[PDB]
Antibody
Framework: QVQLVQSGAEVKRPGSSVTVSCKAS????????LSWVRQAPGRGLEWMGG????????NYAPRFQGRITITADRSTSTAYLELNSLRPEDTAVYYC????????????????????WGQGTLVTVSSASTKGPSVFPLAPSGTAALGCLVKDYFPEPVTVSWNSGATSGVHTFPAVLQSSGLYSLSSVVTVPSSSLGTQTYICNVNHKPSNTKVDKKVEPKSC | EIVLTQSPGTQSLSPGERATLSCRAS???????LAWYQQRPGQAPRLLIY???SRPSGVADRFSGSGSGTDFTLTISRLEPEDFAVYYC???????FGQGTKVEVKRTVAAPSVFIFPPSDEQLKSGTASVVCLLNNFYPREAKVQWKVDNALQSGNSQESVTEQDSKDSTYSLSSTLTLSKADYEKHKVYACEVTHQGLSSPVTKSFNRGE
């Protein structure tokens, strides 16, 4: 089957330029339309533009006209998307998609709809600098809840686990973009109240982009 | 320009129900070039229908599509647990997308378990303070969280986030975080969060005393 593999995540500053690639492994590459669709966090899908690798024909969405360039590359079977003059609202996940085909294998007729998609590339556009997070414990006050607060980090994502992956009652909340330009999330868990003074709870925070690893023990706070 | 509007915004159904999603076009869609896509959180979209009514191989047959001109309908004959996601319709005869329709699991009303967390001392030695109000496992999604500092109403000083609908009990969880400087605290002493929800006959309020 046709498989699309995109480049890794990128972090850019306003005004700069970013280029995302899509390696099209399989089918034929030259005959079928490769389109780019982006998605801002918590928003819908937006079509940006497309290219047939041969020719090479390219259509752009009016909202991106002039600011955007989409390229083929038949030699490597790889599509390219370059967006310049970036701004904070360009922060989104960018997907590359190839249209589907019917009627014999890679010798088939195009349908128009995007039947094949990439895994997507997260592109953050900020004025902030890569920073490791500070992990402060949300100590517990039947069933009692406690957790860890992952505050002030850049950029996304951050991964939190409990007792090194050991899962029930775990709630890791989506990060929010603070006014400080950094991200902050909270991770809670519900555990029996009669286990809190005996049991060890350790939340494992991992921020790959800043190469940071913190394992914070949440124990009963006492006054 | 062709504009595509989807309906409803949120559809709440139980596993096994017939689902009908709508897509209205501002103007006539040439050669019925209308497509339906499905997307779950943290995943790429997935084609369900193309050419208004044609279904690709691999897509289950509970998914059907119909309509013409300006009115198109996606029909899921009998909802399965994995069908509960966000659905987008797309024109491709300039290509455009709909603003999306979420299909969530409709379950029994459940009141939120409200908790409140005091600023840790570790965060204090750096000189800022974050109070967190937790609403654990509740349904429906619409919930009001109101902060009170010495019985004084707050605004513009808190940010909240909601989890995706749980795969097991189908409930939501909310976390509202009110954060301020060590100047507005200790300049205040008792912290409290009041929660208003359908599962509550009356607004439930949780509180703690600073340093106590």
């Amino acid at each position: 089957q046709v498989q699309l593999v995109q480049s890794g995540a990128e972090v850019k500053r306003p005004g700069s330029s970013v280029t995302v690639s899509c390696k099209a492994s399989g089918g034929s590459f030259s005959t079928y339309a490769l389109s780019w669709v982006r998605q801002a966090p918590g928003r819908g899908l937006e079509w940006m533009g497309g290219v047939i690798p041969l020719l090479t024909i390219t259509n752009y969405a009016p909202r991106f006209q002039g600011r955007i360039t989409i390229t083929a590359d038949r030699s490597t079977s790889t599509a390219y998307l370059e967006l310049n003059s970036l701004r904070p609202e360009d922060t989104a996940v960018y997907y590359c998609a190839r249209e589907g085909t019917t009627g014999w294998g890679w010798l088939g007729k195009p349908i128009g709809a995007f039947a094949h998609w990439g895994q997507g590339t997260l592109v953050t556009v900020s004025s902030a600098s890569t920073k490791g997070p500070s992990v402060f414990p949300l100590a517990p006050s039947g069933t009692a809840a406690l957790g860890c607060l992952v505050k002030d980090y850049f950029p996304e994502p951050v991964t939190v686990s409990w007792n090194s992956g050991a899962t029930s009652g775990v709630h890791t909340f989506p990060a929010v973009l603070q006014s400080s330009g950094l991200y902050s999330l909270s991770s809670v868990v519900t555990v029996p109240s009669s286990s809190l003074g005996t049991q060890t709870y350790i939340c494992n925070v991992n921020h790959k982009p800043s190469n940071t690893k913190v394992d914070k023990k949440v124990e009963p706070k006492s006054c | 320009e062709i504009v595509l509007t989807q309906s409803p915004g949120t559809q709440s159904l139980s596993p096994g129900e017939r689902a009908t999603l709508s897509c209205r076009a501002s103007q006539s869609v040439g050669n019925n070039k209308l497509a339906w896509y499905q997307q779950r959180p943290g995943q790429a979209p997935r084609l369900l229908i193309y050419g208004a009514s044609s279904r690709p191989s691999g897509v289950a047959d509970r998914f059907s599509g119909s309509g013409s001109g300006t009115d198109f309908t996606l029909t899921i004959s009998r909802l399965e647990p994995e069908d509960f996601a966000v659905y987008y319709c797309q024109q491709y005869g300039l290509s455009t997308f709909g603003q999306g329709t979420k299909v969530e699991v409709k379950r029994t009303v459940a009141a939120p378990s409200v908790f409140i967390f005091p600023p840790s001392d570790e965060q204090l030695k750096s000189g800022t303070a974050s109070v967190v109000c937790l609403l654990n496992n509740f349904y429906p999604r619409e919930a009001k969280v109101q902060w009170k500092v010495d019985n004084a109403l707050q605004s513009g000083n808190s940010q909240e986030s909601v989890t995706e609908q749980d795969s097991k009990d189908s409930t939501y969880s909310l976390s509202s975080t009110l954060t301020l400087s060590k100047a507005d605290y200790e300049k205040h002493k008792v912290y409290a969060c009041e929660v208003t929800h359908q599962g509550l006959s009356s607004p439930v309020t949780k509180s703690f005393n600073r340093g106590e």
